[PDB]
A paper describes a structure:
One such protein, MRB1590, was originally identified in MRB1 complexes immunoprecipitated or tandem affinity purified with GAP1/GAP2 (21). In vivo experiments suggest that MRB1590 effects editing of several mitochondrial mRNA transcripts, in particular that encoding subunit 6 of ATPase synthase (A6). Structural studies showed that MRB1590 contains an ABC-like ATPase domain, which is embedded between N- and C-terminal domains that harbor novel folds. We show that residues in the basic N-terminal domain are involved in RNA binding and crystal structures capturing open and closed states of MRB1590 suggest possible mechanisms for how this protein may participate in RNA editing processes.
Numbering used by the authors:
A (entry chain A): 52 to 174, 185 to 195, 198 to 493, 505 to 525, 533 to 578, 580 to 602, 609 to 665
B (entry chain B): 52 to 174, 185 to 195, 198 to 431, 433 to 493, 505 to 525, 533 to 602, 609 to 665
The structure:
């Protein structure tokens, strides 16, 4: 009631008047309360941050399995908050807002279920928003619409008026997914692909499942295996993949890349639509690709590449313009340093030189003269002595056959288990890694340059003061709120110049890190980044550290490996050993 | 004079009266004049478009070799306007402006010399700009600063007060530079790389040459050749590449991607620093890569990929989400139909399946294997259609029997090893229709649109609600180029009915297209795109087709092939045969 009357009150009057609202809290409905987090300078300044608060109607016991909030499995708290976001957002598609100024920015959820700062379940329901409040004169009627006519009905009908059965099933599917990824290394696998999974996406620029003429994934028998889901009781069946080397071989339009992308997202749980639901991978899995002109600092790529020009150091690599082989190797070590157990390779984004060696090529120029020691030679070593496994798509090269654990053959989106035939083909055709990695972070040479503000640019980049970090090929980033999280971390690392050691220890301390779902090889770089991640988790995916330029509640969880990767490619980065 | 005397008058007054400034044209100095092409609505709005006019002081005789404007070689006209802007911009680093509002937006030219609408030479000098005229009570003093203090000294000192000896030398390098490529197909070559060239760049995110410890290009003797530049008299020497197949072989970190990138830009002339200056390629050459999830419509990918799943037609291919080989082959023909003469490949960003087939792969599963690799179509394409290929190969000597020359690179030093290489092979040892039927269908193509077309940086096109991915069309090298493409799309759309057949004709008529420097296999698609390019050229890089959201003078020339690639991968592209 009173907010409106207030606005009538200030309806004509000048814009400055608005700075009164901030902090000033009003109840706009019986079941809705509004709290003002900021009030911006003008209409065109991006949003005026507000906290929408409304009662939590559903039974915790039925959906969260406990009466007291604090006991609830965080996974289910996430799936809940995730769901509410989804429901509120769908409210626009169901013509619920009697009016749609469209000046209401609230973070849009991916197809993946991540903890987001956006909705918090507290004891109530906490939804953060950004609103473009309506000439120089104020125009209260605009706002008046915006709250009473657009937000209240959406809240009351899609948020307060939730559907419990839907909620409960959301949460059950999600949780069963987490648990099912928690069962992986135990059950004997590194990846599991559920039967009937609709892997292929809707469009090359789309993440939703394929509506038309999808072919449900079917595991070969020899690779078939089953599980029991705890919360649904549903028992499911599919393709299990042992530790070691999984080869995905077929030449054509067959589905190879499509399966693999499923596996990269395999570290996520997605809304029951997604159709990749219950395709799961080790939660530390990393899409490994050549990436070029990326900068490297302090990575020891010496396992793969041996003989740089001009006696330049393999063992502590450093460039601001990297090669396809060198940076791919850079990414493999970058990864191991952050502790990945399952590398994911799509050969078409991989640096052929790294991958294998041609006879003609070696005889043309002697391999003594060639630096590179290809991946095939390091792979058996990595699985046997390190428990690091690889799944990779190979297009037309059987060189990997003596090393291959399984050889898959994809044809028109159908798989066959051809591991026997292939190693038979191989047949008739016939460690090196330091886990304790000496890499500390140097905030001095790293941050000397800058002049600030830190902010996430879409899904692609980080505005880091005058600097700009390119994540366009950190392919497992799948939300804007993720890169935003990363921005929070960077602005933190920057702001407190006690923290590197402090976070390094904060990290060495931990036994398990948070998955982006909420559920819980070393070095000081690694461990530090773990410290940052962990601290961020602590403060509810919202560090506020001063140099950060971010709205309240547009942040999504992300693995520590991603914060790793983002710093890892700061091109002002400096690092010591 | 009069402008400021106006402004203070206004300075209390409301922003609106700035709508008086429209059209009204003022002289803020002897050698300066400004014309207001627009006025922003708001202080925020991206700026207010103005024409900056100043006298042409230099002797046209020495620089353009004619007293009369209209005779001037457009190559030297471009190099002129290029140089003018460049100095103007340099005016900021030389402490020239008295004040620095930074409300002045004027296109930043790249290292490339391109025709740009920004500076025009007419009879004088024409520079287009965008200004943010500053509380929302007018900031008359602020504006006064922008013009009396910032723009004028820049103009008078760096533009009116230009340096003719440099400008002359600019133009000589540029012109001599264009001529050197015109000489290429004649002199018997497809690529020429000048000795002493500095190929590599300062940083993975930078286009400027490698300042520190660059190693100068040197041609192997066997491939060495020389030319004579008409305008400088200078005689230059380097690496000549014949028609046919050139293989770039090597190990790692030796500079192949460096050389190749130089060759991709080889369709451009660079400001005399750039250091790739006098590296030239066929001005039609295209960087061919696997581009995944790109949409295809109407491409006959048949020569490489003869089979698909489900009787899907290779001969008229269509996907909204695409494969590495499938996309790459689309690219090869997309480019062929637009008339490429040299295909440029980095075996790394190429889809390997398209490139060779392993013995082991072929046996494990027989080829009766959609794909027919490039190695087989290469001789054919060369011999029968005069389309050549230079490609970086990482470790596969399979191409050796097909190889014209085999280049071996080692620590930034090339060697001719084609003898030894083909021996290696010896020791271990048409299809394409030029007449491709592809008409453009504006009906199905433009149905879903409500508009506005605007280029997003260098990377994408906001085509109404649609978005086009130019992120892997690697030879786009300016924002003004993407803006150009946006102009053309806005044209095909707004002038929809008669513009397709008309441009098709307007393009069949043409025996030469305009190179981006200004100097001057068929299908209706192609001929149409050529029509668009040529009409754009005619119209001075300013087609204000009505649905174009663009400031005046933020446009740069492109090849026709580029406009081809953008339309080509529109996700609502419908095309008929
Ligand atoms: N199981 C499926 N059902 C329906 N469509 C599919 C399926 N799998 C893949 N697709 C579509 O097939 C197209 C090509 O599949 P893709 O995943 O690229 O095969 P691929 O092996 O990567 N070929 P390549 O990378 O060229 O060697 C993509 O558009 C997919 O969306
Ligand atoms: N003339 C030069 N002077 C100095 N540095 C150079 C020169 N040419 C190349 N480089 C460096 O080498 C890198 C490019 O070479 P690169 O692409 O690694 O060769 P490559 O071995 O063919 N690639 P790959 O085989 O895929 O690893 C750049 O990052 C440059 O820094
Ligand atoms: Mg390279
Ligand atoms: Mg390379
Ligand atoms: Mg693919």
């Amino acid at each position: 009631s009173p907010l409106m009357d207030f606005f009538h009150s200030v309806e004509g009057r000048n814009y400055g008047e608005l700075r009164s609202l901030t902090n000033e809290t009003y109840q706009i409905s019986e079941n809705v309360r509004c709290t003002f987090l900021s009030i911006q300078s003008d209409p065109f300044a991006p949003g005026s941050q507000v906290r929408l608060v409304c009662p939590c109607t559903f039974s915790l016991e039925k959906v969260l399995q406990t009466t007291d909030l604090a006991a609830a499995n965080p996974c289910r708290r996430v799936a809940a908050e995730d769901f509410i976001l989804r429901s509120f957002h769908a409210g626009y598609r169901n013509g619920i807002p009697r009016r749609t100024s469209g000046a209401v920015q609230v973070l849009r959820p991916s197809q993946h279920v991540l903890e987001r700062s956006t909705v918090g379940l507290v004891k109530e329901i906490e939804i953060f928003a950004r609103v473009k409040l309506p000439g120089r004169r104020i125009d209260g009627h605009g706002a008046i619409d915006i709250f009473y006519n657009e937000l209240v009905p959406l809240l009351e009908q899609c948020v307060v008026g939730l559907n419990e059965e839907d909620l409960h099933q959301h949460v059950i599917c999600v949780h069963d997914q987490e648990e099912l990824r928690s069962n992986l290394l135990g059950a004997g696998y590194v990846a599991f692909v559920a039967n009937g999974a609709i892997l292929p996406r809707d469009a090359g620029n789309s993440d939703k499942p394929l509506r038309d003429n999808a072919v449900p994934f079917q595991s070969p028998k020899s690779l078939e295996c089953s599980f029991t889901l705890p919360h649904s009781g549903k028992t499911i069946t599919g393709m299990g993949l042992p530790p070691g080397l999984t080869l995905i071989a077929g030449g054509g339009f067959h589905g190879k890349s499509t399966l693999l992308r499923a596996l990269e997202v395999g570290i996520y749980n997605h809304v029951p639509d997604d159709g990749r639901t219950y395709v799961v991978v080790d939660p530390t899995a990393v899409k490994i690709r050549a990436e070029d002109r990326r900068s490297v600092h302090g990575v020891d790529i010496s396992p793969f590449i041996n003989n740089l020009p001009f006696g330049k150091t393999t063992n502590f690599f450093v460039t601001a313009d990297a090669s396809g082989s060198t940076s791919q190797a850079a990414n493999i070590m970058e990864a191991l340093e952050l502790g990945s157990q399952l590398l994911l390779l799509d050969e078409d984004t991989c640096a052929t030189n790294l991958m294998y060696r041609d006879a003609l090529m070696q005889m043309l120029v002697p391999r003594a003269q060639e630096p590179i020691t290809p991946f095939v030679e390091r792979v058996a070593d990595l699985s046997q002595n390190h428990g690091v496994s690889s799944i990779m798509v190979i297009g037309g090269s059987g060189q990997y056959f003596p090393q291959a654990r399984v050889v898959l053959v994809m044809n028109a989106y159908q798989i066959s288990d051809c591991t026997k035939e292939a190693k038979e083909i191989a047949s008739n055709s016939s460690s090196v890694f330091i886990p304790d990695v000496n890499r500390c972070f140097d905030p001095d040479g790293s941050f000397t340059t800058v002049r600030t503000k830190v902010s996430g640019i879409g899904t692609e980049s980080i505005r880091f003061s005058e600097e700009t970090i390119d994540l366009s090929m950190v392919e497992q980033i799948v939300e804007e709120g993720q890169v935003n999280a990363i921005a929070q971390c960077l602005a933190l690392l920057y702001d407190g110049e006690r923290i590197v050691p402090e976070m390094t220890t904060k990290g060495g301390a931990l036994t398990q890190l948070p998955s982006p779902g909420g559920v819980c090889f070393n070095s000081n770089f690694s461990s530090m980044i773990a410290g940052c991640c962990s601290h961020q988790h602590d403060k509810r995916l919202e560090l506020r550290t001063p140099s950060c330029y971010l709205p309240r509640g547009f942040t999504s969880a992300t693995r520590h490996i991603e914060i790793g990767a983002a710093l890892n490619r700061l091109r002002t980065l400096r690092t010591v050993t």
